Design a protein around this ligand. Structure first.
Ligand SMILES: Nc1ncnc2c1ncn2[C@@H]1O[C@H](COP(=O)(O)OP(=O)(O)OP(=O)(O)O)[C@@H](O)[C@H]1O
Ligand SMILES: Nc1ncnc2c1ncn2[C@@H]1O[C@H](COP(=O)(O)OP(=O)(O)O)[C@@H](O)[C@H]1O
Ligand SMILES: Nc1ncnc2c1ncn2[C@@H]1O[C@H](COP(=O)(O)OP(=O)(O)O)[C@@H](O)[C@H]1O
Ligand SMILES: [Mg+2]
Ligand SMILES: [Mg+2]
Ligand SMILES: [Mg+2]
Lengths: 49, 504, 69, 471, 49, 469, 52
């Protein structure tokens, strides 16, 4: 039963590391997009506050 | 990604001085007196370290840090999130070891939950509560017979550094297997290896099917140890108010064990002294009694209007050289509805549970006992009181008379009856059967240095020859006149048969 | 006023600087504003007026680690 | 609203608030902090620090407060309701009803918490015995009318049960009302087990609860609330005193009052005194106790429970109250464990009113002789521990038998003890108990064994039990 | 062995790691534009490993 | 980098001002050039304001003025870790002090301030660790990979027990050992421990050849004593993390605590209890939680704890008590009675003293010995004034057995041949259990008490009694 | 009258035993042993020739 619990823990760790390894899948893409798609003057208008 | 244009004007301040887990936050106006300050991630740090804005001085906010303060530097920005400290509550906390912030630390995965309860709240009230009636069967015959604990009772376990306080608490937690009660074990300031050993003990006996562990180890910050018992108390409040499914029934009864409120008070004293608050006795802050009481008045027994649930508190206090007259021991003794005194002198003298029945008190009393236990425990308590009285003439005064010698010897047999091995709880039917055997002169022939063995073998007898007697006793343990002729027979008969077949 | 600051990720010229300071007519007209280059914001904007911060940065929109993390 | 200030500092349960310099609140004034829920937090001023800044004790959580919050001064100290509207209700330190009943209306009189005690010339020196329903309390340490009486013991000896039993007895068998001050009251002892135990019918449709007032300064309350709850109950009882009625006041614990004072003084930054206690311990205790006096108009007569840790009577909490007592009832755990649940030790239970000129010559003679025979038995029980009673005795058998019979006869079943035992309660008049002990003292009880004296009323009940057994 | 399969599944970028990250970046950074004024080269070079 | 200026010098606490954007971190290390080419490596503890930090000297700081420049290293105190640290003697800063050359730059440097192992890493596996000492192996058995401590006063044998443990177990380790001499007095340490560790040979390699030694001795200022334990723990954690078993001996943890107390007094913190730091519990947790054995590797710790005066209620030993798997208490009364392994059996406990872990007979024998000694302790007041004659026959037999047990716990040590003129004696745990079972059974009742003093197992007592005859 | 009032029972020398002249240690081992025997027999020095 403890081995089954440890297997479930390893599955949860893999699920968490899927997002942890998705740090490079999102951060670099967002940086490149902000360098290219955002370009300059992409500050919108903070009229609400 | 779910952002609602992000227009929130969060109040911010700057860290002007960070010391020993305490940070001065400079201008952080409109902050509530116990908010969570965020410390947003910065260069070289990808996580947010939360703090508790305790000291709201003029033009200064002193906040204790719930984590490592080494990464917090002077000039760092802090945002005053409007939320107070809250922890996840519900069914998903069962079987999980979490830190006082609710984050799982056993590595088994994220906590599944839908409700967050604040760790700080007012006690259930005045008209909310009800008289304590349902017993908490600890499985220890001494406690369950002489210092009973009921559902909704604050029972202190006070003792020396190594006397069995954690053992008593763990045995009590283990005994609530099919009793329909959710146990919570808050580890405050304990070493992480000890908490791991406790969790392993609970897993060995299958107690983690219904147990939540909220541990703040010694290496963690004093802020985490300070909110360590209030978290977990929130979980017990949610269990006692909303209920939780367990073995197919909606359990609304909780048993919370603060394994060190002495260490909790030490952590709060460290917090207060680092905040430069005025000291009191033994350098403790003035509001250290207000602290524990605020924690311990939340353990209630609600009436049927408010759900009928209950939260049972088992504070644990470690005294130095059996000095129960210190500040924190006196505070917790005054707050609680009963005390369990454990002595190292009794522990070394063979009395393994180490119950000091003479000074241990249960203010609920017979209301926290089954009617069978009430019937079979009054004579036991009276005889033990007589033995404690005239035990002075027992070491070297040997002549005495027939009456004094008989009372001394009966007290010795009853005291030997109360000795229990660890991790071997006794069911209430077994306890009342053994106490009926002892209190009705059925043990007057078997000598003293066999009594415990006798008890064990008797229970084995009742577990093999006559299980129906145990079932009969357990079925009618609640009637006012417990020793009915149906139950008095087949129990006296069982005792006589066992005494005949077994030479003792 | 003295604590008012505008912080983006990209470096600003005078035109967008004065355009941003024009928008702050909501608080005190032409508020005393300091700018910081801060290239780690990964786009967006941070507006600190007095003791209040509007964090419109895309890093804040991504909330650092994704909600899945 | 005389003045409105702002909160400057929030340190635990201590609030520093800045007020206009010409409208600073007074020393014991009450200041209300309005919260965003329709309720308010009432703090009590304690000091005036410099120019318009006041330090106040919170009397509340202060977990919802921020700096700069509006604070409305009330101009006067905490005002609590007085009158028949408070009869049959449960209050807190602020006078707000904490039971399920509706709020107290604005037509009732509200009196300030802090009031000067009666003057020296108003003291009624005429000592009068207050009839309690307890045999041992009547005989050994009689209850003085208009005086202050204390109960001392460990934990679980029976102080709270005794207090609520006097409430029930003096409300049922007598017309005297009662006011209860749950200082540091446990939420199990106060929210239950006293409300239910005061649902005991008086005559047909009125319970003891309906004729009593309760003010619970609970344990989870901040130290200021537990400090001023006693004065709140005193203010509530002083209305009934001023009406000419002889009012009864039960302070359920004294050492918690001392602890609350010590915590309040430590939180305010006052210099510690003695073993870390408050410098104003004697003054605070005097301010509480000196309002409980017998005046020409009425009389507040009080019983105050005191818990001595272990056997330490030299701690500041029992030491500061000894000067204010007219009688002490010393509860013992040894007597309690001997199933004598009213575990009063007849020895070491004194009273100033136990004088032949006050309680009469017969009462004094009976009490003194009972104490003498019990003192003799205190040595004779040791003597017979090894040398059996039948072996040798020069009148020692008779005096041992009489002493055992009277120490069992001191035990009395309580009305509020039906939950613990099931035996119905008994009330004995002060005349009947002294008459019964006089009858039992010289013969007339030597033939009845020491089993019919266990839980009885007067000696007539012991007899009726004996000839009921011999049928 | 079970975690090896999850690691191999997560090693694919566009299958389960790049598409979700790109969609989240499009939804958060701008008004739901996967490319907008760029991000074409970063679609396959998001992981850069 | 980040050059600042010294503002104040109070004791070993140096308050230095830095530029606003270049303030050192909380546990960062800052060097004062001090002249002559040798620096003083202070360690920051607090940040006070606009670039103002407070640091602990880690050195003499007795001849440096205000206004001196301070160079921020930008990183905490880094000490070398690896096989290069085996057979070497180090400082608080990781600088070798022996005659050997300096540690090369290729050796990995690790910060001395690391997070303790998490909850998932903890290893609860426990088994008997035989030491050869009767009272230790019977009453408070050692745990392999578990934390044990030897409390004691001043003149009791703490260092002698540590030396005997090293002489008994460090020749067979299956791993490495680390010795942290925190306030060790430098005579009974490197002058003696290092000399005896180079004399013990393990398969043509000395014990010292597989031992790291880090010495924050008593002569050092409070900072060196305050961080030397963490330095030694950082050096041991490398061998633990790579799977090697570690035998960790830290001598006088109380010296660590006392150094922390002196620093806190100089740091302006508000004291708690008897002049101790407010952060005593957190400091104890920071040092002690890094000592725990984990799943990757095991550390078998054996700490010594000094007790001020003889007060076991002092905050420092009291904080140590809850961090242990086995506790040994040394009493001055037993030591003055010439029972030099002066372990109090009633005040010494162990976690593995369980019939499932150590054995049914071992548990029964230990519990009966403790029960007999507790009965003796209860009857001490009777014996003191009335004498032995008033006791009952069973009580007389119990007291005689207890006196024989008290004398029998004394054992000659290999390192204690100078004091007692007897050869060192090693007694296995099985022989200890059998001998005490025979003593409790009734054998040896005819033997006088003096034949149980400084012997091995029961066969040695029998042989001595037959020789006397 | 024991003016050099050396408490031989509790006075120790952790080092310096090896730093002793071999003559002194050779003639002082027996002295220390017999002083220990005398201290052991001190409690028994209350019998009227019952031990000889
Ligand atoms: N009934 C018992 N029978 C046998 N041994 C017991 C019993 N109760 C406790 N022990 C012993 O107590 C130890 C377990 O720790 P214990 O429960 O005494 O801790 P504690 O009193 O809470 O204090 P701390 O955690 O500070 O050491 C073990 O050595 C165990 O053998
Ligand atoms: N008159 C009585 N009859 C039976 N039991 C009593 C009586 N008085 C006290 N007790 C016992 O004492 C307990 C209540 O004690 P309590 O008065 O609350 O303690 P304290 O004196 O510390 O306030 C009850 O559980 C009950 O068992
Ligand atoms: N096993 C032993 N045999 C003989 N003498 C001992 C033994 N243990 C300690 N001693 C005595 O104790 C002294 C050493 O005490 P030590 O352990 O150095 O004190 P500390 O506790 O300060 O380290 C020595 O002088 C020696 O006489
Ligand atoms: Mg414990
Ligand atoms: Mg009470
Ligand atoms: Mg030493």
């Amino acid at each position: 039963a403890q081995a089954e619990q440890e297997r479930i823990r390893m599955l949860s760790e893999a699920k968490s590391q899927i997002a942890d390894l998705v740090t490079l899948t999102a951060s670099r893409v967002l940086g490149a997009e902000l360098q290219a798609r955002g370009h300059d003057a992409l500050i919108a208008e903070s009229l609400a506050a | 990604s779910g952002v609602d244009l992000q227009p929130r004007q969060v109040n911010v301040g700057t860290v002007i001085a960070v010391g020993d887990g305490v940070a001065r936050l400079s201008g952080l106006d409109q902050v509530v007196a116990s908010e969570i300050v965020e410390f947003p991630p910065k260069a070289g740090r990808n996580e947010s370290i939360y703090g508790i804005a305790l000291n709201l001085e003029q033009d200064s906010v002193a906040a204790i840090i719930l984590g490592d303060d080494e990464t917090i530097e002077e000039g760092d920005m802090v945002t005053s999130t409007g939320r107070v400290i809250s922890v996840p509550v519900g069914q998903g906390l069962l079987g999980r070891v979490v830190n006082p912030l609710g984050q799982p630390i056993d590595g088994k995965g994220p906590i599944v939950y839908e409700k967050t309860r604040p760790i700080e709240r007012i006690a259930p009230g005045v008209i909310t509560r009800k008289s304590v009636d349902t017993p908490v069967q600890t499985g220890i015959i001494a406690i369950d017979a002489l210092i009973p604990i009921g559902r909704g009772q604050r029972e202190l376990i006070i003792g020396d550094r190594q006397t069995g306080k954690t053992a008593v608490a763990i045995d009590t937690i283990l005994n609530q297997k099919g009793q329909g009660m959710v146990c919570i074990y808050v580890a405050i300031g304990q070493r992480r290896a000890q908490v791991a050993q406790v969790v392993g003990t609970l897993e060995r006996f299958g107690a983690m099917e219904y147990t939540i562990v909220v541990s703040a180890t010694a290496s963690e910050s004093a802020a985490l140890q300070y909110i360590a018992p209030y978290a977990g108390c929130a979980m017990g409040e949610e269990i006692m108010e909303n209920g939780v499914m367990l073995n197919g029934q909606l359990v609304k009864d909780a048993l919370i064990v603060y394994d060190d409120l002495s260490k909790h008070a030490v952590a709060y004293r460290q917090v207060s002294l680092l905040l430069r608050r005025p000291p009191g006795r033994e350098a403790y802050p003035g509001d250290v009694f207000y602290l524990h009481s605020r924690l311990l008045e939340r353990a209630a027994r609600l009436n049927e209007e408010y759900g009928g649930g209950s939260l049972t508190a088992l504070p644990v206090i470690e005294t130095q050289a059996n000095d129960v007259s210190a500040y924190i021991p006196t505070n917790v003794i005054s707050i609680t509805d009963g005390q369990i005194y454990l002595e190292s002198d009794l522990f070394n003298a063979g009395q393994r549970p180490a119950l000091n029945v003479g000074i241990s008190v249960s203010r609920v009393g017979g209301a926290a006992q089954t009617r069978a236990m009430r019937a079979v425990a009054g004579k036991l308590k009276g005889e033990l009181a007589q033995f404690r009285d005239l035990a002075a003439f027992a070491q070297f005064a040997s002549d005495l008379d027939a009456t004094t010698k008989a009372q001394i010897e009966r007290g010795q047999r009853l005291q030997e009856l109360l000795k229990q091995p660890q991790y071997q709880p006794l069911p209430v039917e077994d306890q009342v059967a053994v106490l009926y055997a002892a209190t009705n002169n059925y043990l007057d022939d078997v000598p003293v240095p066999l009594i415990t063995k006798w008890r064990d073998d008797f229970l084995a007898f009742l577990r093999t020859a006559h299980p129906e007697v145990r079932k009969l006793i357990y079925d009618n343990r609640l009637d006012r006149k417990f020793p009915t002729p149906e139950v008095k027979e087949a129990l006296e008969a069982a005792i006589k048969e066992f005494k005949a077949t077994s030479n003792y | 006023a003295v604590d008012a600051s505008v912080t983006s990720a990209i470096e600003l010229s005078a035109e967008q600087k004065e355009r941003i300071t024009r928008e702050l007519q909501q608080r005190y007209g032409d508020v005393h504003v300091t700018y910081h280059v801060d290239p780690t914001l990964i786009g967006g904007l941070i507006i600190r007026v007095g003791d209040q911060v509007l964090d419109n940065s895309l890093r804040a929109r991504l909330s650092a680690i994704q909600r899945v993390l | 609203m005389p003045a409105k200030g702002v909160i400057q500092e929030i340190i635990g349960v201590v609030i520093r608030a800045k007020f206009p310099e010409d409208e600073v609140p007074e020393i014991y004034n009450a200041i209300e902090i309005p919260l965003g829920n329709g309720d308010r937090l009432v703090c009590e001023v304690q000091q005036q620090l410099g120019n318009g800044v006041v330090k106040a004790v919170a009397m509340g959580s202060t977990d919802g407060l921020r700096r700069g919050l509006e604070v409305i001064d009330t101009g006067r100290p905490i005002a609590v309701p007085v009158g028949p509207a408070t009869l049959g209700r449960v209050f807190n330190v602020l006078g707000d009803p904490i039971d399920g009943m509706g709020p107290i209306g604005p037509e009732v009189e509200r009196r300030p918490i802090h009031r000067d005690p009666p003057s020296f010339e108003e003291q009624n020196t005429q000592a009068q015995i207050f009839e309690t329903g307890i045999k041992v309390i009547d005989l050994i340490a009689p209850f003085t009318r208009g005086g202050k009486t204390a109960i001392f013991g460990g934990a679980g000896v029976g102080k709270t049960v005794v207090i609520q039993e006097l409430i029930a007895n003096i409300a049922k068998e007598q017309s005297g009302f009662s006011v209860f001050a749950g200082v540091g009251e446990r939420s199990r002892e106060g929210n239950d087990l006293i409300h239910e135990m005061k649902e005991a019918r008086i005559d047909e449709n009125t319970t003891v609860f309906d004729k009593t007032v309760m003010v619970f300064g609970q344990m989870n309350e901040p130290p200021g609330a537990r400090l001023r709850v006693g004065l709140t109950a005193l203010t509530m009882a002083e209305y009934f005193r001023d009406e000419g009625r002889d009012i009864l006041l039960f302070i359920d614990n004294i050492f918690r009052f001392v602890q609350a004072g010590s915590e309040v003084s430590s939180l305010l930054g006052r210099m510690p005194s003695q073993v870390g206690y408050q410098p104003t311990l004697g003054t605070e205790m005097g301010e509480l106790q000196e309002r409980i006096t017998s005046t020409k108009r009425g009389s507040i007569t009080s019983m105050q429970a005191v818990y001595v840790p272990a056997d330490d009577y030299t701690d500041p909490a029992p030491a500061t109250v000894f000067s204010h007592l007219d009688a002490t009832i010393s509860l013992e755990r040894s007597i309690a464990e001997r199933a004598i649940f009213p575990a009063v030790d007849p020895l070491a239970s004194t009273s100033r009113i136990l004088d032949p000129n006050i309680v009469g010559e017969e009462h004094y003679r009976v009490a003194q002789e009972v104490k003498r025979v019990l003192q003799r038995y205190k040595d004779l029980k040791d003597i017979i521990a090894i040398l059996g009673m039948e072996e040798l005795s020069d009148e020692d058998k008779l005096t041992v038998q009489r002493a055992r019979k009277i120490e069992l006869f001191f035990s009395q079943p309580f009305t509020v003890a039906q939950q613990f035992t099931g035996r119905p309660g008994k009330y004995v008049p002060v005349k009947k108990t002294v008459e019964s002990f006089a009858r039992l003292l010289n013969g007339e009880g030597d033939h009845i064994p020491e089993s019919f004296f266990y839980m009885q009323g007067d000696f007539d009940d012991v007899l009726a039990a004996y000839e009921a057994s011999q049928k």
